[PDB]
Amino acid sequence: GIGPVTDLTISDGPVSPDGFTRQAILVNNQFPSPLITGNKGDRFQLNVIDNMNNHTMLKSTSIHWHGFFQHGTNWADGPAFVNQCPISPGHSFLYDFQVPDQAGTFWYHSHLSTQYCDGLRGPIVVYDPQDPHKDLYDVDDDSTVITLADWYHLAAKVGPAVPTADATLINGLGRSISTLNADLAVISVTKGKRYRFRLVSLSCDPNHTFSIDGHTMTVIEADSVNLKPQVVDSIQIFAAQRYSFVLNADQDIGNYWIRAMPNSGTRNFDGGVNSAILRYDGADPVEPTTTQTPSSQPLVESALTTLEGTAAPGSPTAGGVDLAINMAFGFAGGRFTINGASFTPPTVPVLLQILSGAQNAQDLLPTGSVYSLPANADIEISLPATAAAPGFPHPFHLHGHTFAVVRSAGSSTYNYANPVYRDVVSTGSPGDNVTIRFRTDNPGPWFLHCHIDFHLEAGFAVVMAEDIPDVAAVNPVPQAWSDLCPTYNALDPNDQ
Ligand SMILES: *[C@@H]1O[C@H](CO)[C@@H](O[C@@H]2O[C@H](CO)[C@@H](O)[C@H](O)[C@H]2NC(C)=O)[C@H](O)[C@H]1NC(C)=O
Ligand SMILES: *[C@@H]1O[C@H](CO)[C@@H](O[C@@H]2O[C@H](CO)[C@@H](O)[C@H](O)[C@H]2NC(C)=O)[C@H](O)[C@H]1NC(C)=O
Ligand SMILES: [Cu+2]
Ligand SMILES: [Cu+2]
Ligand SMILES: [Cu+2]
Ligand SMILES: [Cu+2]
Ligand SMILES: [Cu+2]
Ligand SMILES: [Cu+2]
Ligand SMILES: [Cu+2]
Ligand SMILES: [Cu+2]
Ligand SMILES: [Cu+2]
Ligand SMILES: [Cu+2]
Ligand SMILES: [Cu+2]
Ligand SMILES: [Cu+2]
Ligand SMILES: [Cu+2]
Ligand SMILES: [Cu+2]
Secondary structure, eight states: OBOSEEEEEEEEEEEOTTSOOEEEEEETTBSSOOOEEEETTOEEEEEEEEOOOOSTTOSOBOEEEETOOOTTOGGGSOOBTTTBOOBOTTOEEEEEEEOTTOOEEEEEEEOSTTGGGGTOEEEEEEEOTTOTTGGGOSBOSGGGEEEEEEEOSSOTTTSOSSOOOSEEEETTBOOOTTOTTSOOOEEEEOTTOEEEEEEEEOOSSOOEEEEETTOOEEEEEETTEEEEEEEESBEEEOTTOEEEEEEEOOSOSSEEEEEEEESSSOOSOGGGTTEEEEEETTSOSSOOOOOOOOOSSBOOGGGOOBTTOOOOSSOSSTTOSSEEEEOOEEEETTEEEETTBOOOOOSSOHHHHHHTTOOSGGGSSSTTSEEEEOTTOEEEEEEEOOTTSSSOSOEEEETTOOEEEEEOTTOOOOOSSSOOEESEEEOOSBTBEEEEEEEOOSOEEEEEEESSHHHHHTTOEEEEEETGGGHHHHSOOOHHHHHHHHHHHTSOGGGO
């Protein structure tokens, strides 16, 4: 794909991924946003050029490179009012970082308000030249990235505060109930070959239960973390998660429905909604007529494990860490709260507050939403599900880190010995107590938030201000970053 060194010019333009025309955000004149690729170890220099003129979809922008640790480049992480002020329309801003020791499937998306819902979001693959799973597949390239996305006929700031999707897009295409003739995505395979498919959820809200008629899927990666291979016949993937799965194109040459059932909006497949086409070379260019069978080996997160079976940080019992934090979810005044506070973006980005002299979490805004974390410590965070935070299951995402999911949704057990590690986790449903652990090896302020973008917008976030005293020294910032806030703050309000 493009990158690791590339311009990304952001503009507004008409699109019709489901047959319906609407204005959306393009990236290098493309919708959906294009795939960016590099290799493990690469330096990425992604020059984001903000050419948008549409105020309703936000003329300013900021982009987060989801899944990348950004060690020593916290200023490049993307979240507006946490790690930067937005880039202003008519300006450009260079994200320049490296990706030491990561490889897998990632994505990028606007991290200003609900802007990515308007279409600034695309996949990223960082290949590993020594990928330990290479021996399982023959093909892994542009054409094996499979994105899922929600799509709305009304823009993020035009529809309901928490909208319902008119379509599910698979690789940027799909049908709405009003567009049953729209083009479907087609994914081609050749009989006898093995494919590393990289399934990326670009969704702003719904999760999708993904399956392919007549085929199983061997999962080998979760959110950029190599797993032990696990055969499954369906994958519930939440907003912002990734999986690689190997598909062996070992069935009869034909067309087979690829299905992505969301948890809200239209949940059926009538007339080819929520669907795409797996077409073996030599198949007729027509719609599949395959029928779905019940999933009998769904992916189960607590059954996943890392390739090395790496233990969770800290000691194998509850609270065996340096610092344990429970995040009690709630809702009040139409905003989400975590431990009683709703995140509201501060005028001065949290990172800039720290570089300006804020010496502890008590000094940081917004008050009540910022947690201090000590350096080089084992952290445990528990995220108990509650109906008091409406719109569960909420997929929580921690910036700056991968974490061990010691307890998954739908499971009553704790696993300190060999739990899956990942960066987005469903916190599930009342009764669940999803719990995660990570080591504070990455000084900086890092967002922790529900990745349903309408819920983030409603305050469902906190900031982990990790090792505040070393932030400035570990994250020296470039001049162009220092100029972001003065430029943005000089703007007319409707350009912000
Ligand atoms: C900027 O983007 C917005 C949102 O995409 C466009 O909003 C449309 O406005 C018309 C008229 O008010 C409505 O009938 C549409 O439903 C809106 N579209 C969507 C997708 O919400 C707006 O038109 C764009 N501005 C320009 C100049 O094109
Ligand atoms: C989810 O798990 C967390 C962490 O184990 C629980 O919070 C702990 O509960 C015990 C018993 O009340 C206290 O002694 C601890 O001090 C709490 N730990 C922390 C870090 O605050 C939490 O109660 C569980 N919540 C639900 C709803 O099941
Ligand atoms: Cu204008
Ligand atoms: Cu993200
Ligand atoms: Cu992220
Ligand atoms: Cu370091
Ligand atoms: Cu400028
Ligand atoms: Cu907002
Ligand atoms: Cu067509
Ligand atoms: Cu330890
Ligand atoms: Cu310790
Ligand atoms: Cu949520
Ligand atoms: Cu880390
Ligand atoms: Cu680490
Ligand atoms: Cu985020
Ligand atoms: Cu203006």
